[PDB]
Every structure is written in structure tokens, then in C-alpha cells.
Amino acid sequence: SWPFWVMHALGCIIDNQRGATLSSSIDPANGIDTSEMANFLNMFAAVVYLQNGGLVTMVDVLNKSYQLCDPMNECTPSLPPLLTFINQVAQNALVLASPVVLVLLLSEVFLGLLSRFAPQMNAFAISLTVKSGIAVLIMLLYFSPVLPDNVLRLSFQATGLSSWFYERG
């Protein structure tokens, strides 16, 4: 699952920064609270993954899991690496979302500074009109690297089985 949960987190961060709090709903197939952006990026990742033939690597890693660790030898997941997992997922998501959060912060401080000369201006209400357009504008520029970024660098590989699993028997 690891490449998809990162893009889902990214979409949730964007939809939270642009306001849009109320839009979400719980998906019945999984029981996960799903925004409007998050669903889109989560699909788009799936299709590029399938297109690149990741489907073959999935059956591959399954077969290798049986050859490298066998039901009868009491194969077990390694504890030490499992303890890092949640934090590696969160790290990857933040590292990737950062460029949008920065610009939207600068935007809101810029408006707050401008408000000093016209204190009746509702600088808050203006930002809600602006930030969604800014968000989509910026993501449209950095959109094309999304295809290579996920397809290879985040996809799991059969070589990693050695470190995440070992035999206790």
C-alpha cells in the first residue's frame, strides 16, 4: 500500500490548508475519511502504477515471500523496522506537500501585512477567496513529476523482503 497512502496524505493536507474542512466523507469500503482532492490523487496514482506494470511486481513479491520465508518455519515480521514505519510515511508526505504550504503561508501573511493600512479590510475573508485558486495554480506546475516520483521511487520491491521478514524457526 505504501505509495498510495502518501498521495492520500498529500491530498488531505492540501484540502485542509485551502479551507474546505466540511467536504469530506467516510468511505464505506475502507472506513477512511476522504476529502475531494485526496480521492483524485489516490486514483491517479493507482492508474499510473498499473500502467507501469507494477501488477507483475505484486505477484512477484508474493511468490518470493513464500520462497524466502515458509509457513512451516514460523516466519515473522521484524520488530525494529516495523517501529519506524508510521514515521517514514509521514515524513515522505510532508517532504512532498511542503512547497504548497509555504506559498499559502506567505500569501496569508502578505495579506495581513497589507491590512495594516486599511484596518477595516477583512483580510481573512479575502484569503478564502484566493487560496483555492492559488493551490490549484501551483500544483498544476509541479504536476508532471508526480508520474515518475511515485511509480519507481516509492514502489516496494522484492529485494526488501530480506530486511522486513526473517524466520524464527
Site for other proteins, residues 63 to 92, rule: CB under 8 A = 77, 79-80, 82-87, 89-91
Q: What is the CA radius of gyration of the chain?
A: 21
Cell reading at 92: 515522505
**Which of the choices ligand LDA, other proteins, none does residue 35 contact, using the CB cut-off of 5 to 8 A by kind?**
other proteins
Backbone angles phi, psi at 34, to 5 degrees: -120, 120
Site for ligand LDA, residues 73 to 92, rule: CB under 6 A: 76-77
**Which of the choices ligand LDA, other proteins, none does residue 141 contact, using the CB cut-off of 5 to 8 A by kind?**
none
Binding residue for other proteins (CB under 8 A) from 67, 71, 72, 144? 144
Question: What is d(CA 3, CA 89) in angstroms, rounded to the nearest whole number?
Answer: 9
In whole angstroms, the minimum distance from the beta carbon of 63 to other proteins comes to 14
Q: Which element (helix H / strand E) includes 75?
A: strand 75-77
